[PDB]
Design a protein around this ligand. Structure first.
Ligand SMILES: CN1C(=O)C[C@@](C)(CCc2ccccc2)N=C1N
Length: 360
């Protein structure tokens, strides 16, 4: 799939985007790749931060759905008008599908000033689509209208500019080393998974595993940080500082920390495996959670559950195997390492009562 290799670009902190075309004749747009939502939504009016925007009036294949959507978040919000149109991915499979598109007509704290993308491709499931689950997500339309196999994979490489690969409909073995290990998608809404154990520096947190997934744990290409429930976060900071100059605000991501150009440990998440009582672990390095910015501590707290963002994903090739309701992780070919260590994916381990780790 050398076709699709290196089809992702971006800037540090501003997400990964893929080029797409919309409409007839095709309009080129850069589109944020987001496994944490399910709407395909594109700027459709000259907001001054945008390099480009969807112009429905130019498209002979546009169809108005005559319904608007209001989409607020914790930070920003956007509003738009729903329609369908023909959509392609030039450095993707060789097909053209009719898909839902939200023409964004008004937004606040959503688009990034200085960024080079103009829309968002929500790759998760219909259940969290707005305004509701009848609004078929793009990838569902893609698979339903073509012979493209029902899976995609992401290699996020993070270098100011970043690159990566989104292999649509398959897997490229050049993008990873060692073996793929799979964890069950617990429910098709977000890409939800279950953390059964957490280690730092090899020693374990010894918390009720339910604390790792309150009230969910997801895989999200649209988040930068590893985001942990507060309880989990504090223990992780304790263990990590243990492995100095520790201003409290820094851990709270309230301030920045500057060193000059090992006292930080590896971090292992054990994920629910495919077989009863079997799990595996993925291990990241400080090079994943210390983000060159004066590095920012890229582990943060949340109230939405655990989120495995780019801090987790830049260490791994991640396979979103929707056909088999599962997500695979393998050591990424592009991840940043030493001559001493690497990120790791290892198994099998024996972990009992894994179902109990899921909040409900
Ligand atoms: C974490 N997350 C959101 O808060 C909602 C969205 C839709 C925001 C995507 C976004 C927007 C601007 C910059 C980065 C990511 N997707 C997410 N995955």
């Amino acid at each position: 799939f050398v076709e699709m290799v290196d089809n992702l670009r971006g800037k540090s902190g501003q997400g990964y985007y893929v080029e797409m075309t919309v409409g007839s004749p095709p309009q080129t747009l850069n589109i944020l790749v987001d496994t944490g939502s399910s709407n395909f939504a594109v700027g459709a009016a000259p907001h001054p931060f945008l390099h480009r925007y969807y112009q429905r009036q130019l498209s002979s294949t546009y169809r108005d759905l005559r319904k608007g959507v209001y989409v607020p978040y914790t930070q920003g919000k956007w509003e738009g008008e729903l329609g369908t149109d023909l959509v392609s991915i030039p450095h993707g499979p060789n097909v053209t599908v009719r898909a839902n598109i939200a023409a964004i007509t008004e937004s606040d704290k959503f688009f990034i000033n200085g960024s080079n993308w103009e829309g968002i491709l929500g790759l998760a499931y219909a259940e969290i689509a707005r305004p509701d689950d009848s609004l078929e997500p793009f990838f569902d339309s893609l698979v339903k209208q073509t012979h493209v196999p029902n899976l995609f994979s992401l290699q996020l490489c993070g270098a100011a500019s970043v690159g990566g690969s989104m292999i649509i409909g398959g897997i490229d073995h050049s993008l990873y080393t060692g073996s793929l290990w799979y964890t069950p998608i617990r429910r098709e809404w977000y890409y939800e998974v279950i953390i059964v154990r957490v280690e730092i520096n090899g020693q374990d947190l010894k918390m009720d595993c339910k604390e790792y997934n309150y009230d969910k744990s997801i895989v999200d290409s649209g988040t930068t940080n590893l985001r942990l429930p507060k309880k989990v976060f504090e223990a992780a900071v304790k263990s990590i500082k243990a492995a100095e100059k520790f201003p409290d605000g820094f851990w709270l991501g309230e301030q920045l920390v500057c060193w000059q150009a090992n006292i930080f440990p590896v971090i292992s998440l054990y994920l629910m495996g495919e077989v009863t009582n079997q799990s595996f672990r993925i291990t990241i390095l400080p090079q994943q959670y210390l983000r060159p910015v004066c590095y920012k501590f890229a582990i943060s707290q949340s109230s939405t559950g655990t989120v495995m963002g780019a801090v987790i994903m830049e260490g791994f090739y991640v396979v979103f195997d929707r056909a088999r309701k599962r997500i695979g992780f393998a050591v990424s070919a592009c991840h940043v390492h030493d001559e001493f260590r690497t990120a790791a994916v290892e198994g099998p381990f024996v972990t009992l009562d894994m179902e109990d780790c899921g909040y409900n």
